[PDB]
Amino acid sequence: MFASLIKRFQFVSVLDSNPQTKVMSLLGTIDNKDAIITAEKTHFLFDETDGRSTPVLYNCENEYSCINGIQELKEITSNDIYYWGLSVIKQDMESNPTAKLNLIWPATPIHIKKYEQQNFHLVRETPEMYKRIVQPYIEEMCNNGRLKWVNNILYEGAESERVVYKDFSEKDDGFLILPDMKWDGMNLDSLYLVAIVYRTDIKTIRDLRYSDRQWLINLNNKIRSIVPGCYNYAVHPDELRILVHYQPSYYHFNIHIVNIKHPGLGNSIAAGKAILLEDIIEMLNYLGPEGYMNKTITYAIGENHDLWKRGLEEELTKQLERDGIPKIPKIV
Amino acid sequence: GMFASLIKRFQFVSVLDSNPQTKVMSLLGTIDNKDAIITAEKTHFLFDETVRRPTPVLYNCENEYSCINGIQELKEITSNDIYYWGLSVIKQDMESNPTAKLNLIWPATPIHIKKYEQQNFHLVRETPEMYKRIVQPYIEEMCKWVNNILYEGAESERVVYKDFSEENKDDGFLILPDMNLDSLYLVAIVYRTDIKTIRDLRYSDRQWLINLNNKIRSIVPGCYNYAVHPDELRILVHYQPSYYHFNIHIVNIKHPGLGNSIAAGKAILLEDIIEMLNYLGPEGYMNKTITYAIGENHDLWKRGLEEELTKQLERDGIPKIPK
């Protein structure tokens, strides 16, 4: 299915290019419907290898590990103790693929606006701004469409072959953990999982009250007690960065689980987007009974985000004015 | 030739660094029993050297090796609703689409070996009691070059902004670069000397911090002719900080280079420090339990954070490998 759709993709324009991270997003069409492809070069590989078994960390004995797959070298130049050149390395679908590809199709305007390159703004969202600007947006943006994949995973067996943990009695307390769409699933250094809760009344951290703290504590404990054993303790419980996003892309409470060794894709682990789950728990001690409903939350938003023109832009200008920040002359 | 000959003789010793963000790998080894460093980096995808309309949205994908044109083989990972994702093999070629950059340092010096070593990190949960027992005595032992910059003119040629009036001898600061405007990275070092980390910020410091937030955003854009806006600066502090003298990092919100340096678990937004002081009571961050990523090379790791992390995991009922 995947292959068939990639083969029909017709290029329209380049949405974004990041040579630091080797990520690319493409706009196109499939059967005259908009489509988005995101590509990422793979990382280098390392050897995969009482009666306990310990993981061999960072070894280079196997055929495709490290630089064993070099077929061809070419020097660019050299001087003193330095040599600079280029290499071609043997690619192979099973053992050394060249790049990961994601496809969104049919892609919606929200998807295209998200992936187009755009300016970002550090916004300060007060409680009243949330009530006025964001909450009405959330209720609209709770389409059974923009969340169809979440329900697909929860109730229709989607990616069930990949699920790593599932805690469900028929109720609202259970959850499952599975590989994140971002993870290529081969390099443990980039391990990225998402925990999806079954309860539906928490759309964002704004909905977490003081009474939710013990439930959140339990999720933090379960994740760290389970995830390392799924990977033969190749990643330890203290090596998992467990976090939520505000604003999230999808308005259903989901928890991100990332190898501490991962310096991070985009904003997924960045201050201004990511908040540690441990921090969510601790902050509920100090906010009121209504919890994050009472917090003024400062975060990074893109100019293409629907909320920008829906009021965050106008409110950011007024916030800058109130803070005594100059209004930038038109002369520059 | 020579280069190829040296790479073939390289005998792997250990991995210095593996970075899945940048797709970089550094290997320590030997050649003729001398230390050598090899660095490999995946190449970026390629685009046409022409454009399809008078920034990356105008790139094109017409040439043989551009974009994903070289895909020979596809394999699905999974799919869900409108989302499909998988892996691909793409035609490689030395002249038009090489696979990776490959550099050699040989003989590499110990200075060379350092710099390339990336330490491993561990999430610790540092309570108020832990700071007083483990962290605070370490900071006191820490008695430096920072004072050379502040009071002896070091890097004065490089300073971007410096407070001078007696009025803010204490509440003032200076800003200088960290050693393309998208990659703007400045550090504000404050003139007060009693704040070594965020632990020392009290409620009474909230207004002082707000003013710093306002000064930074009012000054930096003008130093760059308003090419970056005040709301395009990611202004943050670190815990643990890189030096135990309070300082604020000022980063282009779009800086593409950065990884761990801006990550939750290390970086905290300045606005968040300000907001949290409304709730932490008079002593501020002294009362906070701070969960953050600590490095294995840090003195605090073997000084008590390791031992405390293992006990925390026991108390929380988390399985771990012992000893």
Coordinates of all heavy atoms in Angstrom, one line a residue, chain A residues 43-49 55-70 187 189, chain B residues 10-18 25-29 38 40:
Chain A
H43 N 20.2 7.3 10.4 CA 21.4 7.4 11.2 C 22.4 6.2 10.9 O 22.0 5.2 10.4 CB 21.1 7.5 12.7 CG 22.2 7.9 13.6 ND1 23.2 8.7 13.2 CD2 22.5 7.6 14.9 CE1 24.1 8.9 14.2 NE2 23.6 8.2 15.2
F44 N 23.6 6.4 11.3 CA 24.5 5.3 11.3 C 24.1 4.2 12.3 O 23.3 4.5 13.2 CB 25.9 5.7 11.5 CG 26.5 6.7 10.5 CD1 26.4 8.0 10.7 CD2 26.9 6.2 9.3 CE1 26.8 8.9 9.7 CE2 27.4 7.0 8.3 CZ 27.3 8.4 8.5
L45 N 24.6 3.0 12.1 CA 24.1 1.8 12.8 C 25.3 1.2 13.6 O 26.5 1.4 13.2 CB 23.6 0.7 11.8 CG 22.4 1.2 10.9 CD1 22.3 0.2 9.8 CD2 21.2 1.3 11.7
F46 N 24.9 0.5 14.6 CA 25.9 -0.2 15.5 C 25.5 -1.6 15.6 O 24.4 -2.0 15.3 CB 26.1 0.5 16.8 CG 26.4 2.0 16.6 CD1 25.4 3.0 16.6 CD2 27.7 2.4 16.4 CE1 25.6 4.3 16.4 CE2 28.0 3.8 16.2 CZ 27.0 4.7 16.2
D47 N 26.4 -2.5 16.1 CA 26.1 -3.9 16.2 C 24.9 -4.1 17.1 O 24.7 -3.4 18.2 CB 27.3 -4.7 16.8 CG 28.5 -4.6 15.9 OD1 28.4 -4.2 14.7 OD2 29.6 -5.0 16.4
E48 N 24.0 -5.0 16.7 CA 22.8 -5.5 17.4 C 23.3 -6.8 18.1 O 23.3 -7.8 17.4 CB 21.6 -5.6 16.5 CG 20.3 -5.8 17.2 CD 19.2 -6.4 16.4 OE1 19.0 -5.8 15.3 OE2 18.6 -7.4 16.8
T49 N 23.5 -6.7 19.4 CA 23.8 -7.9 20.1 C 23.6 -7.9 21.7 O 23.8 -8.8 22.4 CB 25.3 -8.4 19.9 OG1 25.9 -8.9 21.1 CG2 26.1 -7.2 19.3
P55 N 23.2 -5.6 26.8 CA 23.4 -5.1 25.5 C 24.8 -4.5 25.2 O 25.3 -3.7 26.0 CB 22.3 -4.0 25.4 CG 21.4 -4.1 26.6 CD 22.0 -5.1 27.6
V56 N 25.4 -5.0 24.1 CA 26.7 -4.5 23.7 C 26.6 -3.1 23.2 O 25.9 -2.8 22.2 CB 27.2 -5.4 22.6 CG1 28.6 -6.0 23.0 CG2 26.2 -6.5 22.2
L57 N 27.2 -2.1 23.8 CA 26.9 -0.7 23.6 C 27.9 -0.2 22.6 O 29.1 0.0 22.9 CB 26.9 0.1 24.9 CG 25.9 -0.1 26.0 CD1 26.6 0.3 27.3 CD2 24.7 0.8 25.8
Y58 N 27.5 0.2 21.4 CA 28.3 0.9 20.4 C 29.5 0.1 19.9 O 30.6 0.5 20.0 CB 28.7 2.3 21.0 CG 27.5 3.1 21.2 CD1 27.0 3.4 22.5 CD2 26.7 3.5 20.1 CE1 25.8 4.2 22.6 CE2 25.6 4.3 20.2 CZ 25.1 4.6 21.5 OH 24.0 5.3 21.6
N59 N 29.2 -1.0 19.3 CA 30.2 -1.8 18.7 C 30.0 -1.9 17.2 O 29.0 -1.7 16.6 CB 30.2 -3.2 19.3 CG 31.6 -3.7 19.6 OD1 32.6 -3.2 19.1 ND2 31.7 -4.6 20.6
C60 N 31.1 -2.2 16.5 CA 31.3 -2.1 15.0 C 31.8 -3.4 14.4 O 32.7 -3.3 13.5 CB 32.2 -1.0 14.7 SG 31.7 0.7 15.3
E61 N 31.4 -4.6 14.8 CA 31.9 -5.8 14.2 C 31.1 -6.2 13.0 O 31.7 -6.8 12.0 CB 31.9 -6.9 15.2 CG 32.8 -6.6 16.4 CD 34.2 -7.1 16.2 OE1 34.9 -6.4 15.4 OE2 34.5 -8.1 16.8
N62 N 29.8 -5.9 12.9 CA 28.9 -6.5 11.9 C 29.0 -5.8 10.6 O 29.4 -4.6 10.5 CB 27.5 -6.5 12.4 CG 27.3 -7.3 13.6 OD1 28.2 -8.0 14.0 ND2 26.1 -7.2 14.3
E63 N 28.6 -6.5 9.5 CA 28.7 -6.1 8.1 C 28.3 -4.6 7.9 O 29.1 -3.9 7.2 CB 27.9 -7.0 7.2 CG 28.2 -6.9 5.8 CD 27.2 -7.7 4.9 OE1 26.8 -8.8 5.4 OE2 26.9 -7.3 3.8
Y64 N 27.2 -4.1 8.4 CA 26.7 -2.8 8.1 C 26.9 -1.8 9.2 O 26.4 -0.7 9.0 CB 25.2 -2.9 7.7 CG 24.9 -3.7 6.4 CD1 24.8 -5.1 6.4 CD2 24.8 -3.0 5.2 CE1 24.5 -5.7 5.2 CE2 24.5 -3.7 4.0 CZ 24.4 -5.0 4.0 OH 24.2 -5.7 2.9
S65 N 27.6 -2.2 10.2 CA 27.8 -1.3 11.4 C 28.8 -0.2 11.0 O 29.8 -0.5 10.4 CB 28.2 -2.1 12.6 OG 27.1 -2.9 13.0
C66 N 28.6 1.0 11.5 CA 29.6 2.1 11.5 C 30.0 2.3 10.1 O 29.2 2.7 9.3 CB 30.7 1.6 12.5 SG 30.1 1.2 14.1
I67 N 31.3 2.1 9.7 CA 31.8 2.4 8.4 C 32.2 1.1 7.6 O 33.0 1.2 6.7 CB 33.0 3.4 8.4 CG1 34.1 2.8 9.3 CG2 32.5 4.8 8.9 CD1 35.4 3.6 9.2
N68 N 31.6 0.0 8.1 CA 32.0 -1.3 7.4 C 31.4 -1.4 6.0 O 31.9 -2.2 5.2 CB 31.6 -2.4 8.3 CG 32.4 -2.6 9.5 OD1 33.5 -2.0 9.7 ND2 31.8 -3.3 10.5
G69 N 30.4 -0.6 5.7 CA 29.7 -0.7 4.4 C 30.3 0.2 3.4 O 29.7 0.3 2.3
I70 N 31.4 0.9 3.6 CA 32.0 1.8 2.6 C 32.4 1.0 1.4 O 33.2 0.0 1.5 CB 33.2 2.5 3.2 CG1 32.6 3.6 4.2 CG2 34.0 3.2 2.1 CD1 33.7 4.2 5.0
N187 N 17.2 2.3 15.0 CA 18.3 2.9 15.8 C 17.8 3.3 17.2 O 16.9 4.1 17.3 CB 18.9 4.1 15.1 CG 20.3 4.4 15.7 OD1 20.5 4.5 16.9 ND2 21.3 4.6 14.8
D189 N 19.2 4.8 19.6 CA 19.5 6.2 19.9 C 18.4 7.2 19.6 O 18.3 8.2 20.3 CB 20.8 6.7 19.1 CG 22.0 6.1 19.6 OD1 22.0 5.5 20.7 OD2 23.1 6.2 19.0
Chain B
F10 N 42.5 1.8 9.6 CA 41.9 2.2 10.9 C 41.4 1.0 11.7 O 40.7 0.1 11.1 CB 40.8 3.2 10.7 CG 40.1 3.7 11.9 CD1 40.7 4.8 12.6 CD2 38.9 3.2 12.3 CE1 40.1 5.3 13.7 CE2 38.3 3.7 13.4 CZ 38.9 4.8 14.2
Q11 N 41.8 0.8 12.9 CA 41.4 -0.2 13.8 C 40.4 0.4 14.9 O 40.9 1.1 15.7 CB 42.6 -0.9 14.5 CG 43.5 -1.6 13.5 CD 42.9 -2.8 12.7 OE1 41.9 -3.4 13.2 NE2 43.4 -3.2 11.6
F12 N 39.2 0.0 14.8 CA 38.2 0.6 15.7 C 38.5 0.3 17.2 O 39.0 -0.8 17.5 CB 36.8 0.0 15.4 CG 35.7 0.4 16.5 CD1 34.9 1.6 16.3 CD2 35.6 -0.3 17.7 CE1 34.0 2.0 17.2 CE2 34.7 0.2 18.6 CZ 33.9 1.3 18.4
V13 N 38.4 1.4 18.0 CA 38.6 1.3 19.4 C 37.3 1.6 20.2 O 36.9 0.7 21.0 CB 39.7 2.3 19.9 CG1 39.7 2.4 21.4 CG2 41.1 1.8 19.4
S14 N 36.7 2.7 19.9 CA 35.4 3.0 20.6 C 34.7 4.1 19.9 O 35.3 4.8 19.1 CB 35.7 3.4 22.1 OG 36.5 4.6 22.1
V15 N 33.4 4.2 20.2 CA 32.6 5.2 19.6 C 32.6 6.5 20.5 O 32.3 6.4 21.7 CB 31.1 4.8 19.4 CG1 30.2 5.9 19.0 CG2 31.1 3.7 18.3
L16 N 33.0 7.6 19.9 CA 33.2 8.8 20.6 C 31.8 9.5 20.7 O 31.5 10.1 21.7 CB 34.2 9.7 19.9 CG 35.6 9.3 20.0 CD1 36.5 10.2 19.1 CD2 36.1 9.4 21.5
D17 N 31.0 9.4 19.6 CA 29.8 10.2 19.6 C 28.8 9.5 18.6 O 29.3 9.0 17.5 CB 30.0 11.6 19.2 CG 28.8 12.5 19.1 OD1 27.9 12.3 20.0 OD2 28.7 13.3 18.2
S18 N 27.6 9.5 18.9 CA 26.5 9.1 17.9 C 25.4 10.1 18.1 O 24.9 10.3 19.2 CB 26.1 7.7 18.2 OG 24.8 7.4 17.6
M25 N 28.5 10.5 13.3 CA 29.1 9.4 14.1 C 30.6 9.7 14.1 O 31.2 9.8 13.0 CB 28.8 8.1 13.4 CG 29.7 7.0 13.9 SD 29.4 5.5 13.0 CE 30.1 5.8 11.4
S26 N 31.2 9.7 15.3 CA 32.6 9.8 15.4 C 33.2 8.5 16.1 O 32.6 8.1 17.1 CB 33.0 11.0 16.2 OG 32.7 12.2 15.5
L27 N 34.3 8.0 15.5 CA 34.9 6.8 16.0 C 36.3 7.1 16.4 O 37.0 7.7 15.7 CB 34.9 5.7 14.9 CG 33.6 5.4 14.2 CD1 33.8 4.4 13.0 CD2 32.5 4.9 15.1
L28 N 36.7 6.6 17.6 CA 38.0 6.6 18.1 C 38.7 5.3 17.6 O 38.1 4.2 17.7 CB 38.1 6.8 19.6 CG 39.5 6.8 20.1 CD1 40.3 8.0 19.6 CD2 39.5 6.8 21.7
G29 N 40.0 5.4 17.2 CA 40.7 4.2 16.8 C 42.2 4.5 16.8 O 42.6 5.5 17.4
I38 N 37.8 9.3 13.2 CA 37.0 9.3 11.9 C 35.6 9.8 12.2 O 34.9 9.3 13.1 CB 36.9 7.9 11.2 CG1 38.3 7.5 10.7 CG2 35.9 7.9 10.1 CD1 38.4 6.1 10.3
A40 N 31.8 10.7 10.4 CA 31.0 10.4 9.3 C 29.7 11.1 9.5 O 29.2 11.3 10.6 CB 30.8 8.9 9.1

